[PDB]
Amino acid sequence: MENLKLDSFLEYKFLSNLDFNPDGSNLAFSLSEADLENNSYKHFIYNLDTKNKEIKKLTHSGKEKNSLWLNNNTILFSADRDKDIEEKKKLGETWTIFYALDIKNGGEAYEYMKLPVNVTEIKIIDENNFILTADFDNNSLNLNDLKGGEREKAIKQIEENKDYEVLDEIPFWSNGNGFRNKKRNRLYHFDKSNNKLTPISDEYTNVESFNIKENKVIFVGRTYKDKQALTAGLYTYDVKSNKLEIIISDNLYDISYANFIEDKIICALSDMKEYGINENHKIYLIDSNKNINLLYENDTWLACTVGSDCRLGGGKSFKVIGNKLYFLSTIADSVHLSSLDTNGKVEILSSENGSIDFFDIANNEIYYVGMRDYTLQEIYKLENNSSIKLSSFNEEINKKYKISKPEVFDFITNGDTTKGFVIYPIDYDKNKTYPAILDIHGGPKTVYGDVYYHEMQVWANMGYFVIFTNPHGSDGYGNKFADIRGKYGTIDYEDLMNFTDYVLEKYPIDKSRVGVTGGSYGGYMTNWIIGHTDRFKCAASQRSISNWISKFGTTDIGYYFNADQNQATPWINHDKLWWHSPLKYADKAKTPTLFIHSEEDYRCWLAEGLQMFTALKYHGIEARLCMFRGENHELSRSGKPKHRIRRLTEITNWFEKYLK
Template sequence: MEKIKLKDFLDFKFLSGIELSPDKKHAAFAVHTCDYNENKYISNIWIYDCLSEEYRKLTNMSKEKSFIWLDNDTILFPSLREEKLKKKIDDGEHWTVFYAINIHGGEAYEYMRVPMNVNEFKLIANEKFLITAEYNHYGINLHSIKSEDKEEAMSMIKENKDYEILDEIPFWSNGEGFTNKKRSRLYLYDKGTKDIIPISGKFENVSLSSVKDGKALYTAFSFTNKMELTNELYMYDLYSENATRLIEEGEMYIEYAEFMGDEIVFAASTIDKYGINQNLNFYILKNGEPVLLAEHDYGMFNSVGSDCRYGEGAGHRVLNDELYFISTENKSSFIKKLSLDGKIERITYDNGSVDCFDICNEGILFIGLRGTKLQEIYLYRNNLETQKTKFNEDIAEIKNVIKPEPLSFENDGIKIEGWVLKPADFDENKCYPGILDIHGGPKTVYGEIYYHEMQLWANEGYFVFFCNPRGSDGRGDEFADIRGKYGTIDYNDLMMFTDTVLKKYPQIDPCRIGVTGGSYGGFMTNWIIGHTDRFKCAVSQRSISNWLSKFGTTDIGYYFNSDQIQSTPWNNPEKMWFHSPLKYADKAVTPTLFIHSEEDYRCWLSEGLQMFTALKYHGVDARLCMFRGENHELSRSGKPKHRVKRLEEITNWFEKYLQ
């Protein structure tokens, strides 16, 4: 077997967005690959024939990753193929061009072009589409400007690029840049007349949930000064041309809503007991009021971590008046089913990760990771899972993928689950270095699926160990609730886990252990180096160092910090400082590499800079590698060359201090 190399992920195939045709005979999905030389991702739509079980590439322009079915034989997708239009967009115009293609053959043809940046699009009636698109209150929305005024408007657009106006929070968003008074607004687009009719208000941030029989459900955050944590639920009726508010702002946070038979069911949280990380429950609308339908004390998403995904897909579907959804329990994500009587039943049972799925009476097609394999398409039918594609089969066949060994322990009477990757060609008579890897979130989980960076380090001769401390997902609200406790019980879990690993695997040299993590894992890495000198080196990625500064500079700081640290800079600054790793930086002696992205507005660059400066000031070896043009998602969806450089920096740092 060949050892896994750092750049192997450049050859991986990432799958997303599986969607069955209306007649359920075919499924479309996107396949993404890295183009290292061009430093970008190549994306194309593929077709899976449910009868023959064959699959083939449908598009070839390498830019198609989102789509809808127009009918049983036709797919609609946005793409930018015209050079003249590319120039207009570069100059500041907004256009989204949609192409249609028959899945049985023929070239794609232009179907419609919308003079807006379209985010979501759904067919609601013949040649009528619901779209969400960017609306800029302080900007110039060209689609509403007369042609004779367009030249002047274009000049103003160029001039406005030199400054930003801020008069609300959040004023920027990770992956989106400055968002002040910019909204994802809901419109009705008529292909025949080319009319664009706004449905939602100017200050409503909309997410489109469900469309059925000329009606649509959507959620909206409405704000002009400060976005609150609760949103509104609306139903739009195409035929009456009215949008009716079903749930008012201030009652709950609503993740999504679906039509189930004649009922409206939605996943929501009252955020009253466990704060913003409180698990969602299911509600039904009765006489205009939300009524609890089913409690669900597990994550209602796939939160199983991996650095081998790109793109997204549906995490819930409705079939025969039943709602199917992805849920995380312990180390895995599964598909469950909700009935209108409030009963929740788990459908799939195999461990691993379900990333997205679609469903019909014949079974469930899903994209997932099973065992230590990379993403493939699976069919679940008659209580049996069958792999249907072999996009990444050669990786599992020729590469030395190491299976994680489970290792659990108890702390404060609570079981903590973890895993260990032994070094490649492990010899029990040899001594090895080790790496503790800490997940982000904190409300996510590690599982037993493929994680490239960890597999790389194990193949380079390291023990790699990782666990799900308190604060993680999959174990219910109480387990995930570490509000006001950051750096205390979770730190104890991680240190006891390290002790447990060292005891079980005496081949690990306790003087050659490193630690790394990103986001919350970066916070914990910063915390660890200020509270112990047991680690020979550390790598802190997209981290948090100062809860006081993060409160006022990041896209979620004003509500995440106050909720998770249970304080603000005004009502209890001492508590925010107590939980800030920067407070303890003068105690740190561990050589630390910091990885940060210039456009990471979730854990802003200033967080890494403060900790880096503190270590340098106190004479500790430190290095910071900053990536321009990247955000909080660098390790998962950053540009291919940047992902390679990031992993090289980390691996070289470990080699310098641990080998």
């Protein structure tokens, strides 16, 4: 037992890519960890025996995540073990290699496939046919298909073109993926037998999700060439029949799962007429274009929205085995596992406290990885609403370091009851007084839970209270509780301030040393708070919003999201959109504020951070901005190790300067 440190997340293990082979005898998953000297992450591939419950590491180089199961005996993963291709990729050629590793015979991995595109997600029809979404470029110089002098002329042209980015679509970049003007996520079928790659979705369609039955494919599709609209289309494609059928025309609904079920289709849709873009998705059944057939009115977002800075890579959030659809949802501060079969019968399969990040099922045996008992990620078997632990990767962190677990309680504010959390300082004493930090979960509609959060534990190990709550607009309590469109800064700001008052009386907190910090929406809330109260001695805005009208025209989602959340627009009721802009009050802000931001953060553009920083220094308030190159909006969760240290160290040194 020793104190937890700022760089202790280097020792954390992150699990990902939970996957069964068809028989349910072996589980595959990836173990990601930090490589500090190389400023990257190692990727181990692991296997667990579902019958014997024995873990074993498979790969060892540290650059492998499992994509598929080749069959019930061999995993095939993408890697870079061919130098002559790695040099061809530097010249601009698109390629992806896959390697198969058998666990019964043994030995090592061998090369299996070569595909002349950059694969973004792979699904397997057989052993010699694959369904594929991959990187396609409307302006690509197909460098694999040139050989003579045009080869030489194209290599040069590719190099010169790096110096420019051309924009003619309204969503020209996408956070975590750079510029994407006229670049799409194209769907492909590949026949290794004949080495043939066939396009499915045409030149202007982003496959946002896709599922596959036998030789039939169900895929989400958003098509545009000037302006991506708010609606997504559903098409199908049988490989052999090579037919494309416009099922739902492209102007009505937005879809999320859209997988085949039995002989029809189960799909989560929504016409955004009632509660807007982020309206919870009800689930319908479609067949012969019978999209009206509703089987369940769902009032939750179908994902694990319990934020944390101890995750690296996702996994399976849904599954449709047989007749029942197994899907996740967030209800309070917790992730629920639920079913929804052909007769409409919903059942709750796991109501436990912690998070269920992603799961897998095979023979009506349910395995998942999650964070329970305020511990880091481990693999669990789920039987009759209680999880039995199986992996033990991070168990020593909680037995080597002093962790302060959150006190959870009900909190009533603005006519509803949500959750309120308080983390006591390390080596606590109700006789002495302590500083505090109010954390604001940065998703507009996400959730803080009883789940290990490293940045909160770091400040807990240095003598701070760390408090946080789920205000109006958060996930969990339906469209009603999460609807604050046009109310940004009113009831949501009231909820957090009401929660801050309640804590400041119950808990022995020095009211003169209280910090506030949050990312994304919380960064907006941090910018909003300092402009409306003087109750925080210091603040730490990160990946934040500041000027709604300029975020409108510079953000990957700004031109449609900002209107759905403020009911205003730079040209339609400008005063309202300007009213919910925190920079409007920056001439009242007296609280010293540190600004965290990234250069490639396109969910909240860099301009939003610079404005609030310039707005403070212009009025003489102490401020500081740390711009992070080569990182984006997910720096807190998935950024490079050293850059994650710098972000933590900057925020921490800001608190330590003013609050100690």
